[PDB]
Point group: D2
Chain length 116, copies 4
């Protein structure tokens, strides 16, 4: 139930109150499970008061190409956490109780694991 995540973030975001653009990918394959799917989350980290990452996501499942029209779901998720680089880095979880641990690199690298 743990999967690899990888992404990128804007390592030098504007300072005017704007959020920090980011994204990441998870393919839903590990040593035990393979769902023949991948999700991508696109959003922004917003710091300050309490910290949050607001995303929209796309989940694509491998399909025959006569079923390709029904292959992609869309949704939104909001993550709360338990310098863009230090603010993103850590442990986050969502509404449904999924969890992800991220490390934000100085170069714009995002790396970690997503737990379902």
């Amino acid at each position: 139930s743990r999967y690899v995540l990888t992404g990128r973030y804007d390592s030098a975001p504007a300072t005017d109150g704007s959020g920090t653009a980011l994204g990441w990918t998870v393919a839903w394959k590990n040593n035990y499970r393979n769902a023949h799917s991948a999700t991508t989350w696109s959003g922004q980290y917003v710091g300050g008061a309490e910290a949050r990452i607001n995303t929209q996501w796309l989940l694509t499942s491998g399909t025959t190409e006569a079923n390709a029209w029904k292959s992609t779901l869309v949704g939104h998720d909001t993550f709360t956490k338990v310098s863009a680089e230090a603010g993103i880095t850590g442990t986050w979880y969502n509404q449904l109780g999924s969890t992800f641990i991220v490390t934000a690199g100085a170069d714009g690298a995002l790396t970690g694991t997503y737990e379902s």
Copy 2:
């Protein structure tokens, strides 16, 4: 105008005809520009005589909380893998995701796929 791309793919997909699910992300900051934005593509590789990656994408820009409703664009794209040249003996590309891919509008990306599911490359606008 090259930027770092990174992603994941199903390295053990169905052999039933289904394509191979994948995703990747690009942040629009390199050594010389920063557009305070990132794009993620979600889709699948479909192989054969003419290998293609059919995608849907989301582009999010950094915004204030008040402009957050207009932070995210959505769209679609298809990438085709470059094939050997007729002068070399032509033919369809080697099976696999690793390679050079282009879209309709002139963007190109070069990618290396890992045996485990990793994807890393460079995207040129």
Copy 3:
């Protein structure tokens, strides 16, 4: 700030407790302004003590060909149905789509629903 809305809904919903699918469109053109854009909301009504409509939306603006790629926004929204005031006796709203709905941001709509699936109303930003 008031705009015409038109849409459709499933007037014979499932009864295993699923929601009621609907969708609607607002073109951002009225007497007073014109933003050369249209939004469609796709989502479901969930009846209940607190009646809600949960949507995802697409906002498209007219563009030239070279800018088509940046023409559509995507987002999501939840609307909640106005209920009677406590002074009137309170209680939850009577079932149905017909009524007044607000989002968290202060935008409001008034719709009338047809017995056979039609939706019509007025959207106010």
Copy 4:
């Protein structure tokens, strides 16, 4: 297999060679079938000899609370044609073979039927 559609278009679009914003909804219920779901198409009309309507769509199916995160699909459709009012009005078809007949009103109305 015919359904009622209705929508809106910008009835005074820009004059700069820009396309015309529009959108419509179909609920997949009729006298004969009911799939408990609705599609909305958002996009634009591009006029000319080989005129087209380019869209992105959202299909939402009625789900239980629990299932909600997986209720909505996204995709895209391109229609060809078999004054935006004079232009949109008519019969159109897309890749999948679906067809729609639509009347554009002077007011910005779209009404008609969709056949899938």
